[PDB]
Design a protein around this ligand. Structure first.
Ligand code: ANP
Ligand code: MG
Lengths: 413, 232, 117
């Protein structure tokens, strides 16, 4: 009986053998039968550098104990002796006592720490964006499409793009509608990677960026007692989390009914509170909303404090901040129909739009985001699209090549 | 399990007016192939000359402990740890409470035994007592004893304060207490130290206040509900 | 049916004792010797206890005790029994010996000490 210590990369173990009279082959067999280490991986040595190798050939290079024929008695091994065993892979040596992590002493919680750590809900008073200015042409076109082509029966949505000022004021320049499917109480945006890249390239060339998202509420949704539904709030929060801008604006298109019975379409722009974006980025919101779920109150996987009332379900009005709405005539028009709509944009529509604005200058003809994106469907997103967008923004004379290509593709070759 | 993604960084008080580089004259020469066992957080002192430079082990891989082998690839990673790390000098232990050896014994028998040995109480069949009410002359070591017996046992701690709850406006104390209790129960075992309980639950005759009565009633209703036997 | 509860019936609103509202008043007083003996027999049904337990002596010695105080007395007796065995149990080892865990039993002396305390 002899006890031999076995040092490895994972640490240290010990083995009890009959004695030093056996050879390295018997020691390897005992190691295989006790520590369950396969024979083809075991490599024995007396040098401490054996575990510093990174190849089985390097391990076998240490032949002082690699050979199984060598007797163990010739190595003067005794009780408590040291041996080094190397094997392929990394293992967890058993017998490890529990070890506390560093710094885990004095977990003194407090009421204030509870308030800070636990998510709460409040309606922010002043948003980062003091006021958002909407393009009059784009707003008119969007309102016309919502009121006439949809009659406030199918939900429509689009990303808002524009410039952001130092004080936070945003001038809306255009709206981009990705491919999407709309219904009464939901709107699933089948966003396209290439189309979104083209839109971003246009915005970079146009010296602007994403500033918010717009959608319309149907007649039934307007009659309901909320400003936004849970699905709309979730979509807006998701898009804000995707965005890196603090001046995000969620715009609602609502068919209000006056006291005289008339139907007036209103754009209500609100900025979501940073509490909502903090909720979404921490995965508290439930992206799964059932039809039985109440659209009045938002869905959260964990209970939060809604101001003074402790309810897991949170009213959507606690997330919105009133932002003053402004109207301006920017350098971009939106007479061209927005892409991905029910009326799919085609070459005939492009020709009709060009003929309608024939009296306007060529730069003014192409001063429409939807037209620019339709051209971008046939232009290089990396070079041609940013250059064309920059030319549109600066109102500079368009290069002859771009105009010739646009005319050729708009006149059926 | 010799570490791979270890992190070794020095301390501010020893790098003030440092002689210069520590990677090639203080760290590598005395810890490459040295096979010195290292545990995360240890403040170890090394010399690469006349100046002695303390070092704090910020991170190790494996996280708990390892050995400084040549496989360790980290250098002196710039940031020196300030003395503020020792400002929270492991809060309070047991040697920092002295002079009372029977009151602390009773508190230990009432707290540390139920939270670390339910087998005895289950075998006997007795229901251990929950409520404990320290009292004495002001400034005699009550909060210190509570911190000593709650930090040494390693259980979840929750330090409610009297004026801290009272300072909040009406309609929030009733919510703060309930949230505190529901959070403490969720992390069994748990200790709820309610300092200056005389402020939030005074004698009813001595107050005659509506909000005081309401908060007292809320506290009583919550306290009667601790019968979940969830080690609170 | 409405069943009130109080401590001093004088302190209640005097208008609540009129005919029809609260017309029956029952006085749950302090138990006598047999009451204390029965309370102790009810409370010490689950506890392990040696055959030496003299509940009659404990009932006679306790005067002015109510049910809650007798429950507290039984709990104190159990805690004293654990504390006397504490001198051999080590807190650092959560693996308390099974035979040790089953060799602990409350006797009359622990009850007397708890009564004194
Ligand atoms: N028995 C004690 N042993 C050691 N230090 C003590 C003791 N009693 C008091 N101290 C010291 O007293 C100082 C502050 O006393 P502290 O215990 O915080 O007051 P308190 O009695 O908890 N106050 P209050 O809750 O207002 O009654 C600390 O620095 C403690 O170290
Ligand atoms: Mg105190």
């Amino acid at each position: 009986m002899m006890m031999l210590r076995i040092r490895s990369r994972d640490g240290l173990e010990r083995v009890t053998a009959e004695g030093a009279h056996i050879t390295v082959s018997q020691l390897k067999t005992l190691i295989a039968d006790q520590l369950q280490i396969p024979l083809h991986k075991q490599t024995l040595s007396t040098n401490r550098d054996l575990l510093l190798a990174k190849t089985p050939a390097d391990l076998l290079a240490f032949t002082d104990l690699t050979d199984p024929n060598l007797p163990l008695s010739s190595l003067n091994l005794g009780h408590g002796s040291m041996l080094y065993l190397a094997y392929d892979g990394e293992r967890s040596i058993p017998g490890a006592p529990p070890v506390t992590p560093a710094g885990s002493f004095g977990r003194k919680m407090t009421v204030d720490d509870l308030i800070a750590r636990q998510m709460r809900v409040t309606r922010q008073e002043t948003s980062h964006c003091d006021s958002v200015s909407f393009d009059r042409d784009a707003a008119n076109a969007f309102q016309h499409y919502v009121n006439e082509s949809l009659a406030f029966a199918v939900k429509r949505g689009g990303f808002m793009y524009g410039t952001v000022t130092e004080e936070g004021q945003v001038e809306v320049d255009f709206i981009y509608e990705p491919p999407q499917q709309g219904t009464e109480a939901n709107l699933i945006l089948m966003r396209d990677a290439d189309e979104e890249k083209r839109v971003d390239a246009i915005a970079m060339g146009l010296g602007m960026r994403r500033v918010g998202f717009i959608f319309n509420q149907t007649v039934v949704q307007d009659k309901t007692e909320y400003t936004l539904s849970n699905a709309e709030v979730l979509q807006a929060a998701e898009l804000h989390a995707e965005s890196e801008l603090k001046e995000w604006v969620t715009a609602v298109v609502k068919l209000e009914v006056n006291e005289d019975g008339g139907a007036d379409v209103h754009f209500e722009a609100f900025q979501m509170s940073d509490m909502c974006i903090r909720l979404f980025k921490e995965e508290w919101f439930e992206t799964e909303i059932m039809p039985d779920d109440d659209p009045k109150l938002s869905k959260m996987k964990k209970e939060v404090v809604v101001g003074v009332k402790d309810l897991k379900e949170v009213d959507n009005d606690f997330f919105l901040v009133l932002v003053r709405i402004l109207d301006h005539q920017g350098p971009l028009s939106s007479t061209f129909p927005i892409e991905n709509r029910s009326s799919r944009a085609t070459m005939r529509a492009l020709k009709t739009h060009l003929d309608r604005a024939k009296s306007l200058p060529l730069v003014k003809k192409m001063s429409d985001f939807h037209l620019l994106l339709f051209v971008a469907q046939f232009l290089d997103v990396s070079s041609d699209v940013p250059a064309l967008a920059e030319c549109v923004r600066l109102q500079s004379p368009v290069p002859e090549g771009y105009a010739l290509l646009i005319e050729s593709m708009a006149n059926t070759c | 399990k010799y570490g791979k993604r270890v992190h070794i960084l020095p301390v501010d008080d020893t790098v003030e007016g440092v002689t210069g580089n520590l990677f090639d004259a203080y760290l590598k020469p005395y810890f490459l192939e040295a096979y010195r066992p290292v545990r995360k957080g240890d403040l170890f002192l090394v010399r690469g000359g006349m100046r002695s430079v303390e070092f704090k082990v910020i991170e190790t891989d494996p996280a708990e402990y390892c050995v400084v082998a040549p496989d360790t690839e980290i250098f002196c990673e710039g940031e020196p740890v300030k003395r503020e790390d020792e400002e929270r000098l492991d809060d309070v232990g047991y040697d920092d409470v002295g002079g009372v050896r029977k009151q602390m014994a009773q508190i230990r028998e009432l707290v540390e035994l139920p939270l670390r040995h339910p087998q005895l109480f289950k075998s006997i069949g007795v229901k251990p007592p929950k409520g404990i009410l320290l009292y004495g002359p002001p400034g005699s070591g009550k909060t210190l004893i509570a911190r000593a017996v709650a930090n040494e046992t390693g259980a979840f701690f929750f330090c409610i304060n009297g004026p801290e709850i009272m300072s909040k406006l009406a309609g929030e104390s009733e919510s703060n207490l309930r949230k505190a209790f529901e959070e403490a129960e969720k992390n069994a075992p748990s200790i709820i130290f309610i300092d200056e309980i005389d402020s939030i639950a005074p004698k009813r005759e001595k107050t005659n206040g509506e909000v005081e009565r309401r908060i007292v009633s809320q506290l009583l209703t919550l306290m009667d509900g601790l019968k979940s036997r969830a080690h609170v | 049916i409405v069943m009130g509860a109080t401590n001093r019936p004088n302190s209640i609103d005097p208008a609540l004792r009129r005919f029809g509202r609260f017309d029956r008043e029952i006085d749950i007083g302090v138990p006598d010797e047999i009451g204390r003996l029965e309370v102790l027999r009810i409370h010490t049904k689950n506890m392990k206890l040696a055959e030496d337990v003299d509940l009659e002596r404990i009932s006679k010695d306790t005067h002015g005790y109510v049910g809650a105080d007798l429950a507290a007395l039984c709990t104190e007796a159990a805690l004293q029994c654990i504390r006397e065995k504490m001198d051999v149990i080590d807190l650092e080892d959560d693996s308390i010996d099974a035979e040790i865990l089953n060799s602990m039993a409350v006797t009359n002396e622990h009850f007397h000490t708890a009564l004194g305390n």
